[PDB]
RNA sequence: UUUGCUCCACACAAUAUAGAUGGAUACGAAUAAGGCGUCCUUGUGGCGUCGCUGAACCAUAGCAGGCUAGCAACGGUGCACUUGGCGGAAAGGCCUUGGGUGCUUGCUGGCGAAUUGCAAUGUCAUUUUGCGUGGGGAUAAAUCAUUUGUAUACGACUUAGA
RNA sequence: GAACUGGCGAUGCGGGAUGAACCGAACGUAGAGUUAAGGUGCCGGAAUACACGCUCAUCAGACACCACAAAAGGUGUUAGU
């Protein structure tokens, strides 16, 4: 859906042999708290020997964007499962916030590789603080000095089923 | 009986003193002041039909004098208020009708 | 809203126009479509010629006379595409289809009337610039229509007469616009401008 | 004047139906001018008359009326649902019909 | 002679371009394009008209012929200051586009008595114009 | 074939309506281009302006739209004529000259309306036919039967016969 | 030819165009409202909705059961290592 980012902090259940476990923390892009906690336990079952019955979640907090009106370039490292194997990819997206960047990332992977939400693993997402570290041409195209371009062929959708003059596509 | 007393005036468009239903009118934003008219005379017993027997069948085929000078009393007090702002006599004489392209959900009355 | 709607078929897409027009007839609007030789079909001319040849193969084996009829005129091609979208085998479908007449060119009943377009079926508004399209008159004369040039000659004559009409109309409207501008900035003009007209 | 119309024109489109089963008790009306349910909400509760003619004079007239009312909106495009005292005869699919402005609330 | 081309200019999208929000919650106000996200969407701000600073798809706005000076990525105080300095609000209001919008909403706001009044005035104006249509 | 047939006008009946209820309101071409105005050396020309929908434009007041009076203009519109054109794709329509006549809400007045009783389509459209008037217009063929054989199962076809 | 369960047989209804078994849901006679599975260009009730991409096929493709296609290739095009 429209994604939100949460921090989820959890731990193992405390025993007498070891009280105070190590309080692992992860950042999850998810639609809500339930999906966020499910993905948290999914990745902790991939990492450490723990499961939901043997552990607990001590905190979940929404992390909204610090500057939601700054235009950033993000580099995203992703695992995905194809029909024959597992691959790593690095894609970079020029967008205004992290949740919108990963939303366009999920759309991009589903469009160009037919990869689903169950197949995509988000390794990391990070803002590229400096230009000329941008490595893709499709985003390096929009970083030029005095960028301007026209929008040819305007199509205006009509409300009536009949129009009384030939329309114009000037913009 | 939840009815509205209205008048034309009868000199303007020929509508007499009458009562109408509130669900069958449109309240326009045009407002005139009717202070100075003594309408407390009229009530539900003022309009009586004098119901007809079943024997009296009209095979093929009048007005109260009290009603006609009551109309003449009230309408001459209304038209003095009508003469202040222009074009109200013409507006009240003209009829209302929907033209091509009139959308009543967008029209303001 | 109108008694009869006259649609200029030039530059329109066949299927999208037919799906607009069939719903208009089923709702009860009378439609006449003129200039059927200038409809457009998306795709290559060779693709649509191959499509028509695949349609032209289909006929009843034991008697070709009772088979599917392959009509060759552009108007009858449009009629086929529209009869596909009207349930023509019922009385409601027949009553709908008798509210339609489609023509090549603009006949003399309709050359003096007003032609409209359907903006959700126009080729310049629907197709991406770069996609290839066909002309229905060219495809139809490739598959056997005999009257492509006589329609062109009649359309040239009609366009000459219509330009002669339009010059007089433009001169008259320039006179009327001049008189309206000179009769503006009076008191009735400023009151109408305050009231929105 | 030359116009005396105090109603809104509409078209009787069809019955309420699924893909293969129709229901004659609820008719579908296209009111002209309205293209959204929010504008169609103005016309709820208004009376509808289907006015037709017959050869045989019944009570002084050769013109017969079928009365009904608007009940709810239908779809996303301003079609409304209408119920009548006797249902519309289904040969009137595409026939014109009158939406009056009473019962009023303006 | 000299070489002749038809130039065919139209309404470039860049910083400082004034746009009109077509649909949405603003839906009819003016904004200034602050920066360009990608081919299909831009970051705009409309601080005088009350449009919040936001990223928006280019299909939800209409570009106007108005342009003024901004550096890219300008914050809303600078956007409002340059908007007031270039004074593009009455420059928009002087256009026939905004006059058409104002005429449309005025005709929507007319009542029945005012419609009667414009019918009477239009009859008087039609009388004098058709009287003028007899000498030329 | 006992006064029949067609057209025109209204008079009354019948007959129905795939569905009037202000107006189908006429360039062509392009869409990575145009429209309109203006100017010139008339062009793939210069300059200005417009679009961002018909949410337009025209029309629109009067007993379902009456009866009258005046002012101002010499306009606008309807009807029956009338002069001249143009239109063959399915022309059956478009334009125009002249006079008549009616209305004019461009502006200002006078009289009427009720009782359909608090709504009831509250009836005003066009399609076909018949029968009457009274006014024009014109006075045929086909088939069976007979015959032919360029035809033919029979029908049909091709011929002939005051 | 066996094991566990659910069905059809014995069962109509909405969807899968069509079908014993699939999906949804099981049934007195009616009214109103809301939905399931499935859909919303037209047939056909319902957005020619919104948003991001991809594809142009001189046999495109279009939805589980289900009404088929493989190995091997292609400076076609897109995204990656």
Curated annotation (Swiss-Prot), chain A:
Organism of derivation: Saccharomyces cerevisiae (strain ATCC 204508 / S288c)
InterPro entries documented for this protein: Ribosomal_eL20, Ribosomal_eL20_dom, Ribosomal_eL20_eukaryotes
SUPFAM superfamilies: RplX-like (SSF160374)
GO cellular component entries: cytosol; cytosolic large ribosomal subunit
Oligomer status and interactors: Component of the large ribosomal subunit (LSU). Mature yeast ribosomes consist of a small (40S) and a large (60S) subunit. The 40S small subunit contains 1 molecule of ribosomal RNA (18S rRNA) and 33 different proteins (encoded by 57 genes). The large 60S subunit contains 3 rRNA molecules (25S, 5.8S and 5S rRNA) and 46 different proteins (encoded by 81 genes). eL20 forms multiple interactions with RNA and proteins in the central protuberance, connecting components of core functional centers that are located far apart.
Superkingdom as given in the UniProt entry: Eukaryota
Homology family: Belongs to the eukaryotic ribosomal protein eL20 family.
Residues with PTM Phosphoserine: 31
GO molecular function: structural constituent of ribosome
UniProt cross-link Glycyl lysine isopeptide (Lys-Gly) (interchain with G-Cter in ubiquitin), position: 124, 130, 148
Note: Present with 54300 molecules/cell in log phase SD medium. There are 2 genes for eL20 in yeast.
Keyword set includes Ribonucleoprotein: yes
Protein name: Large ribosomal subunit protein eL20A
GO process terms (BP): cytoplasmic translation
Compartments it resides in: Cytoplasm
Pfam families: Ribosomal_L18A (PF01775)
Keywords carried by this UniProt record: Cytoplasm, Isopeptide bond, Phosphoprotein, Ribonucleoprotein, Ribosomal protein, Ubl conjugation
Swiss-Prot record, chain C:
GO biological process, one term: negative regulation of translation
Crosslink feature (Glycyl lysine isopeptide (Lys-Gly) (interchain with G-Cter in ubiquitin)) location: 175
Keyword Ubl conjugation assigned: yes
Cross-referenced PROSITE patterns: RIBOSOMAL_L13
Matching Pfam families: Ribosomal_L13 (PF00572)
Coiled coil (UniProt feature): none
Subunit structure: Component of the large ribosomal subunit (LSU). Mature yeast ribosomes consist of a small (40S) and a large (60S) subunit. The 40S small subunit contains 1 molecule of ribosomal RNA (18S rRNA) and 33 different proteins (encoded by 57 genes). The large 60S subunit contains 3 rRNA molecules (25S, 5.8S and 5S rRNA) and 46 different proteins (encoded by 81 genes).
PANTHER family the UniProt entry points to: LARGE RIBOSOMAL SUBUNIT PROTEIN UL13 (PTHR11545:SF3), RIBOSOMAL PROTEIN L13 (PTHR11545)
More details: Present with 43300 molecules/cell in log phase SD medium. There are 2 genes for uL13 in yeast.
Name of this chain's protein: Large ribosomal subunit protein uL13A
Species of the source: Saccharomyces cerevisiae (strain ATCC 204508 / S288c)
Top-level taxonomy: Eukaryota, Fungi, Dikarya, Ascomycota, Saccharomycotina
UniProtKB/Swiss-Prot annotation, chain D:
Post-translational modification: N-terminally acetylated by acetyltransferase NatA.
Family: Belongs to the eukaryotic ribosomal protein eL33 family.
GO molecular function: structural constituent of ribosome
Name of protein: Large ribosomal subunit protein eL33A
Gene that produces this protein: RPL33A
Superkingdom assignment: Eukaryota
Keywords, sorted A to Z: Acetylation, Cytoplasm, Isopeptide bond, Ribonucleoprotein, Ribosomal protein, Ubl conjugation
Chain residue numbers at which the record places covalent cross-link Glycyl lysine isopeptide (Lys-Gly) (interchain with G-Cter in ubiquitin): 46
CC annotations in GO: cytosol; cytosolic large ribosomal subunit
Residue numbers bearing the N-acetylalanine modification: 1
Localization per record: Cytoplasm
GO biological process: cytoplasmic translation; ribosomal large subunit assembly; ribosomal large subunit biogenesis; rRNA processing
Major place of residence: cytoplasm
Region forming the signal peptide: none
Additional remarks: There are 2 genes for eL33 in yeast.
Function statement: Component of the ribosome, a large ribonucleoprotein complex responsible for the synthesis of proteins in the cell. The small ribosomal subunit (SSU) binds messenger RNAs (mRNAs) and translates the encoded message by selecting cognate aminoacyl-transfer RNA (tRNA) molecules. The large subunit (LSU) contains the ribosomal catalytic site termed the peptidyl transferase center (PTC), which catalyzes the formation of peptide bonds, thereby polymerizing the amino acids delivered by tRNAs into a polypeptide chain.
Keyword presence, Ribosomal protein: yes
HAMAP family, per database record: Ribosomal_eL33
Swiss-Prot record, chain E:
Broad class of where this protein is predominantly found: cytoplasm
Keyword Isomerase: no
Stored CDD domains: eL14 (cd23702)
SUPFAM superfamilies per record: Translation proteins SH3-like domain
Post-translational modification: N-terminally acetylated by acetyltransferase NatA.
One BP annotation, GO: ribosomal large subunit assembly
Keywords, comma-separated and alphabetical: Acetylation, Cytoplasm, Ribonucleoprotein, Ribosomal protein
Annotated compartments: Cytoplasm
Superkingdom of this protein's organism: Eukaryota
Cellular component annotations (GO), alphabetically ordered: cytosol; cytosolic large ribosomal subunit; nucleolus
Cystine pairings recorded for this chain: none
Alphabetized GO MF terms: RNA binding; structural constituent of ribosome
Function text: Component of the ribosome, a large ribonucleoprotein complex responsible for the synthesis of proteins in the cell. The small ribosomal subunit (SSU) binds messenger RNAs (mRNAs) and translates the encoded message by selecting cognate aminoacyl-transfer RNA (tRNA) molecules. The large subunit (LSU) contains the ribosomal catalytic site termed the peptidyl transferase center (PTC), which catalyzes the formation of peptide bonds, thereby polymerizing the amino acids delivered by tRNAs into a polypeptide chain.
Note in the entry: Present with 45300 molecules/cell in log phase SD medium.
The protein's name: Large ribosomal subunit protein eL14A
Species whose genome carries this gene: Saccharomyces cerevisiae (strain ATCC 204508 / S288c) (Baker's yeast)
């Amino acid at each position: 859906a429209h994604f939100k980012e949460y921090q989820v902090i959890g731990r193992r259940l405390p025993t007498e042999s070891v009280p105070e476990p190590k309080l692992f923390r992860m950042r999850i892009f998810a639609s809500n708290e339930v999906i966020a906690k499910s993905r948290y336990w999914y990745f902790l079952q991939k990492l450490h020997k723990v499961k939901k019955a043997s552990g607990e979640i001590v905190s979940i907090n929404q992390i909204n964007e610090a500057h939601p009106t700054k235009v950033k370039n993000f580099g995203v490292w992703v695992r995905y499962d194809s029909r024959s194997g597992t691959h790593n990819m690095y894609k970079e997206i020029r967008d205004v916030s992290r949740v919108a960047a990963v939303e366009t990332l999920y759309q991009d992977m589903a469009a160009r590789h037919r990869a689903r939400f169950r197949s995509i693993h988000i390794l990391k997402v990070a803002e590229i603080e400096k230009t000329a570290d941008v490595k893709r041409q499709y985003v390096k195209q929009f970083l030029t000095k005095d960028l301007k371009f026209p929008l040819p062929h305007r199509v205006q959708k009509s409300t009536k089923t009949f129009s009384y003059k030939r329309p114009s596509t000037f913009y | 009986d939840n009815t509205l007393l209205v008048t034309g005036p009868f000199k303007v468009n020929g509508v007499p003193l009458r009562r109408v239903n509130a669900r069958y009118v449109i309240a326009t934003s045009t407002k005139v002041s009717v202070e100075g008219v003594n309408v407390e005379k009229f009530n539900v017993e003022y309009f009586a039909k004098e119901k007809l027997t079943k024997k009296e069948k009209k095979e093929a085929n009048e007005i109260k004098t009290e009603r006609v000078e009551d109309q003449k009393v009230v309408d001459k007090a209304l038209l003095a208020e009508i003469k202040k702002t222009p074009l109200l006599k013409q507006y009240l004489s003209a009829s209302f009708s929907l033209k091509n392209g009139d959308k009543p959900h967008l029209l303001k009355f | 809203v109108e008694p009869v709607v006259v649609i200029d078929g030039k530059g329109h897409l066949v299927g999208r126009l037919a799906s607009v027009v069939a719903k208009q007839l089923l709702n009860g609007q009378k439609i006449v479509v003129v200039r059927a030789e200038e409809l457009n079909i998306s795709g290559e001319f060779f693709r649509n010629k191959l499509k028509y040849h695949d349609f032209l193969r289909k006929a009843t084996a034991f008697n070709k006379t009772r088979g599917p009829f392959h009509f060759r005129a552009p108007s009858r091609i449009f009629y086929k595409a529209l009869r596909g979208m009207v349930s023509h085998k019922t009385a409601r479908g027949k009553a709908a289809l008798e509210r339609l007449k489609v023509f090549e060119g603009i006949p003399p009943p309709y050359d003096k009337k007003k032609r409209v377009v359907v903006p959700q079926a126009l080729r310049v508004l629907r197709l991406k610039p770069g996609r290839k399209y066909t002309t229905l008159g060219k495809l139809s004369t490739s598959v056997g229509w005999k009257y492509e040039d006589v329609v062109a000659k009649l359309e040239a004559k009609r366009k000459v007469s219509s330009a002669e009409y339009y010059a007089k109309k433009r001169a008259f409207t320039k006179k009327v616009a001049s008189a309206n501008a000179t009769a503006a900035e009076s008191d009735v003009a400023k009151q109408l401008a305050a009231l929105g007209y | 004047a030359e116009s005396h119309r105090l109603y809104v024109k509409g078209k009787h489109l069809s019955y309420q139906r699924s893909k293969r089963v129709n229901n004659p008790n609820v008719s579908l009306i296209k009111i002209e001018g309205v293209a959204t349910p929010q504008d169609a909400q103005f016309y709820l509760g208004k009376r509808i008359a289907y006015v037709y003619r017959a050869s045989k004079e019944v009570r002084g007239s050769k013109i017969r009326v079928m009365w009904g009312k608007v009940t709810r909106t239908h779809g996303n495009s301003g079609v409304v649902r209408a119920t009548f005292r006797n249902n519309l005869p289904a040969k009137t699919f595409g026939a014109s019909v009158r939406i009056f402005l009473y019962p009023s609330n303006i | 002679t000299d070489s002749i081309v038809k130039a065919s200019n139209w309404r470039l999208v860049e910083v400082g371009r004034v746009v009109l929000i077509k649909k949405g919650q603003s839906a009819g106000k003016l904004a200034a394009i602050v920066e360009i996200i990608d081919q299909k969407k831009v970051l705009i701000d409309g601080p005088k008209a009350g449009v919040p600073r936001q990223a928006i798809n280019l299909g939800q706005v209409v570009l106007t012929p108005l342009t003024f000076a901004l550096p890219r990525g300008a914050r809303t105080a600078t956007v409002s200051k340059k908007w007031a300095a270039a004074a593009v609000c009455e420059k928009w209001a002087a256009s026939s586009w905004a006059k058409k919008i104002a005429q449309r909403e005025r005709r929507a706001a007319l009542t029945d008595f005012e419609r009667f009044q414009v019918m009477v005035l239009r009859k008087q104006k039609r009388y004098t114009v058709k009287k003028a249509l007899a000498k030329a």
